[PDB]
Amino acid sequence: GHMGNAAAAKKGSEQESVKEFLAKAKEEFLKKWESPSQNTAQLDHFDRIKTLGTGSFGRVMLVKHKETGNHYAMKILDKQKVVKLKQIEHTLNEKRILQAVNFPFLVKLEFSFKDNSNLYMVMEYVPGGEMFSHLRRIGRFSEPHARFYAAQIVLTFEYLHSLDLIYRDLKPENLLIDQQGYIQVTDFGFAKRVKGRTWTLCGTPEYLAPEIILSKGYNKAVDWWALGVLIYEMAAGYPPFFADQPIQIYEKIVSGKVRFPSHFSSDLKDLLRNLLQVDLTKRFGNLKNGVNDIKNHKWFATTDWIAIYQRKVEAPFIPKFKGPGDTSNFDDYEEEEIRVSINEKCGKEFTEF
């Protein structure tokens, strides 16, 4: 067979240890899931420094804790805009998830609070910038470089899925690079705790699984499709399915006729054909052996999963950091004032925040 006695026993033991870890992790998550933290700081505890990124109902700002001088990334959500965009449940669920999870590649929520106008999530500042920036700067990642990042996502999804969380917005734009060159996943605005199937049309066009586009229901295997898209984009410099308009992207996805750059290794192509598999009964991560089909694939043969988790692997790219509060790895964004109304807005809608 493929493994001699020693290798087979070692892999078996490793897989049983993952089960043991996930059992404890789930117990810890559920305690916090049922009893979330609330109101652990206030706005005048921080100086506002610079905008790090923006969206339609809020923005993320670099801030500095006045008492200790520590820097954080503070997401500011305009309650009225959140209501207008029908994002109430998404924003409450994002904060509920963030305060309950714990994993080395998930950004940590350090404080949260609200005032008359806004919601605030104060997260760790991840100063290396977005994977998106580095990928577009360098063109494409060599396969070992891509594999280093991919392994972190594999572990992170293995953890999230054990909690019945489906992530649903994987893409380089949502992955930050920390000072040691490891990945941080940040944005849980479309994640859902789901035991079985769900139906919502959500995510980003290039990363949607065929079964999200189509009316049929879908399960956590959409995240393994999205991993395939991410690995492809990291290694090629462009995603497997693109077009001028999303509707044309969806047509290509549902066909699923993927083609590969000639520099892709055969191992990489085999992995991607098994992740970018339209047939759910054949997609890696969705078969009887679960995540083990991915982790044991030849393309990951050099990956030491425990060493990745322990952050003991030397990263392929270490961002330049000229000191605390340095934003040289981020784009510039227009700076607007942060106004706090004299009158409370949408109080009842956001009681749980």
């Binding site: 998106f132 734009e173 605005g189 479309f190 959500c202 980003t204 290039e206 077009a243 001028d244």
Partner: peptide, 18 residues
């Protein structure tokens, strides 16, 4: 080439969720 088509697609910048 595929890369040239990617540039021409206009979807090389940050992509919003739907």
């Amino acid at each position: 080439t595929t890369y040239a088509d990617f540039i021409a697609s206009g979807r090389t910048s940050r992509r919003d969720a739907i």
